[PDB]
């Protein structure tokens, strides 16, 4: 009541090392670390495979 608190429960699914994606868990960001929104290019780099086996399901 004194202040407004906004808390999100969030699950880890994978890690970026650099310009690439690794899938896994058991990885812990230290507290106070910043949280951002995902850009669309970062999202569409994932869910995309080599052009020889791409199926655009929608």
């Amino acid at each position: 009541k004194d202040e407004d608190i906004f808390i999100l429960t969030v699950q880890p699914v994978g890690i970026f090392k650099g310009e690439e994606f690794f899938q896994g868990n058991s990885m812990l960001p230290s507290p106070t670390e910043p949280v951002f929104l995902v850009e669309d290019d970062i999202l569409n780099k994932i869910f995309s495979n080599e052009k020889t086996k791409i199926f655009h399901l929608g």
Binding site: G24, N25, S26
Partner: protein, 59 residues
């Protein structure tokens, strides 16, 4: 008589329980079907039940 088993399967809930219950050692890779994980947990020795929760996470 000189025979033993090293059963391999994707669906432990489908392999008959009369043979899987005879396995004394286990080599457990990643499991993602809850119905199979519950079976493999219940079949495991008691001491390994605590450490067995890694199966969905192993990669």
């Amino acid at each position: 008589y000189g025979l033993s088993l090293m059963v391999v399967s994707q669906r432990p809930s489908e392999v008959s329980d009369t043979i899987l219950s005879q396995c004394n050692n286990f080599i457990n890779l990643r499991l993602t079907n809850i119905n199979d994980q519950n079976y493999i947990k219940n079949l495991l020795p008691d001491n390994s039940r605590s450490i067995s929760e890694i199966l969905p996470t192993l990669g």
